[PDB]
UniProtKB/Swiss-Prot annotation, chain B:
Peptidase C30 domain ranges (all copies): 1-301
Cytoplasmic side: 1-301
Effect of residue 90 to R: In strain: Beta/B.1.351
Protein name per UniProt: 3C-like proteinase nsp5
Function as written in the Swiss-Prot or TrEMBL entry: Cleaves the C-terminus of replicase polyprotein at 11 sites. Recognizes substrates containing the core sequence [ILMVF]-Q-|-[SGACN]. Cleaves and inactivates human TRMT1, preventing tRNA guanine(26)-dimethylation of tRNAs. May cleave human NLRP1 in lung epithelial cells, thereby activating the NLRP1 inflammasome pathway. May cleave human GSDMD, triggering alternative GSDME-mediated epithelial cell death upon activation of the NLRP1 inflammasome, which may enhance the release interleukins 1B, 6, 16 and 18. Also able to bind an ADP-ribose-1''-phosphate (ADRP).
Localization: Host cytoplasm; Host Golgi apparatus; Host nucleus
Active site: 41, 145
Effect of residue 49 to A: Does not affect ability to cleave and inactivate human TRMT1
Quaternary structure and interacting proteins, as annotated: 3CL-PRO exists as monomer and homodimer. Only the homodimer shows catalytic activity. Interacts with host FBXO22; this interaction promotes the proteasomal degradation of nsp5.
Amino acid sequence: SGFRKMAFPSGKVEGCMVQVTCGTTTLNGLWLDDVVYCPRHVICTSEDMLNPNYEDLLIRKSNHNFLVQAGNVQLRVIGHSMQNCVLKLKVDTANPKTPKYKFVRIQPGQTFSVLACYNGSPSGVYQCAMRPNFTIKGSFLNGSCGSVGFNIDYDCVSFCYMHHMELPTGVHAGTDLEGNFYGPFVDRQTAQAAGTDTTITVNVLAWLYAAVINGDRWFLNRFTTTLNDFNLVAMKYNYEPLTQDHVDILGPLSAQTGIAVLDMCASLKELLQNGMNGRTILGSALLEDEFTPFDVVRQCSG
Amino acid sequence: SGFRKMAFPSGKVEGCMVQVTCGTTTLNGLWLDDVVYCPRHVICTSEDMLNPNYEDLLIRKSNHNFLVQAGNVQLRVIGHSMQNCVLKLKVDTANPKTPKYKFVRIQPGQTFSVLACYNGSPSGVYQCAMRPNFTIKGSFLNGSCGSVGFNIDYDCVSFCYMHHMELPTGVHAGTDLEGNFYGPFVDRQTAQAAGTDTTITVNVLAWLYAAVINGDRWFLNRFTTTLNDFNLVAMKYNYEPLTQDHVDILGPLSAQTGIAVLDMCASLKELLQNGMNGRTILGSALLEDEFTPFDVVRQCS
Ligand SMILES: */C=C\C(=O)N(c1ccc(-c2ccccc2)cc1)[C@@H](C(=O)N[C@@H](C)c1ccccc1)c1cccnc1
Ligand SMILES: */C=C\C(=O)N(c1ccc(-c2ccccc2)cc1)[C@H](C(=O)N[C@@H](C)c1ccccc1)c1cccnc1
């Protein structure tokens, strides 16, 4: 019994973190086979943050300008390059601790584990959701950049995030490992705002099933409702629309608990409208949207 | 910026995790040097859960009655002794993945990272507090037993918890690695009442200092108070006493934020008396007591 924000074991990813340096600029990198990945803004200096030309800045520097320094060792650069917003620093020495890995671009609402690193040292691990506005509510300090988000699928590490920057609002923005930003963000010191942070409705329903499964089921109501009726309520409270896929994806939890999806939607409508009258669900004063239906099965079944 | 329930990288602990079978019963062990630690209740059937005798059950068993499996590998058991509520199985092989480690007994209000394990396989990692009533609100399913809690210090792992059982309330009971239960709990299937759990006052205070450090300043009032005046309100709302050591520990934060500990003490009292009014601090609509003053400093500096 019990239910917690659980990350994946960070072992396999600890052995992939490296320190990368260009002049005063020192940040984290990911070392997989004969390639080191980091954010391209390692080549930028405080003079060229307002409006950098990354092609042009890369020209200034060459293979030997990159201090790819791995746990007190040194690595030789055999051919750098630029993939959108990340550098592929080709090393001679392949990483012997390379897990079976894959690069994925995760959809908004999907969760992942972050290994927060400073100077290439695994510093801490926490679970995160890709917000609908393509930000993450993380925990990052200066030199965090290059810290990675990953999901472990058996023996296969699926890297989905590389941390780049914090926005004026204090939330965080990054890229897949092919260097494409999530959301409309760019790697320059400009006025950037995230859109409306809507609530991930399908995740909140997963978490309620999770609560029932623990025996914390006071909120269960004597009502029902419809997708259309529920969505009109959802929109008013800036909850993501609930689609039929999202009803189907909640299939397994509907099965065990014996409580239909719409009745769970019916119980959620009340809590949105009536608040929680000072009560709690799984020791939480508010509705948690940072657990996918997969995350709940994983933890409530093995 | 930003502030989260963070755990320590689990990698140095993953290499210490092993499976232990004895009869039908399977759980997790901790393989450090040539010793494998696990909960001693691995020797008990469904017929000896109410009231087992762990001396008259151990006696009946021998080295080869114990399967120790490290990943896909098998370990030769050449010894078995009982220390309080842990088994210590001597094996033919030093774990070459053994980190520099320590066994520490941890105090209530203290936090640690747990690596939840099933059949010797690291399944997940989360930060967890030793609660006043010596329970933990963890996440553990059948076969989670022998999963361990730990703090990490540069390269030196501090083992503090081993999980043993779930109480009929859903909260969890375990030992230090020397086999002594935190709290009055016993490894059998009897009526066992968790003490009434208080709030970890000093931790809530460090949480507010974190909030302030992120820019959340709305709960800061014009008032001040005293250790005694505050402690009176503390005991009232089932909050642990605040002590001078507690105030000393909070200094680094106090100095950083410019807010003297007794001023933050005053602000806390006004949230306790007035409630939070639907308002939120660091994304939380109730007061968080599961970050220590160390946890904040690590995460905020
Ligand atoms: C990894 C560095 C870092 O920690 N931050 C950061 C500094 C500078 C850049 C940058 C340099 C040159 C060209 C483009 C970008 C990127 C990241 C900071 C951070 O994100 N600061 C914000 C305000 C920033 C700086 C520059 C451009 C846009 C935005 C940071 C701070 C806290 C947590 N994570 C990162
Ligand atoms: C290690 C296996 C368990 O998960 N587990 C357990 C605890 C104690 C014994 C035992 C002790 C003394 C003598 C004989 C046997 C055996 C197994 C427990 C457990 O059994 N929990 C029960 C209370 C339970 C709760 C909720 C749902 C199903 C069962 C356990 C179970 C889950 C998490 N941690 C521990």
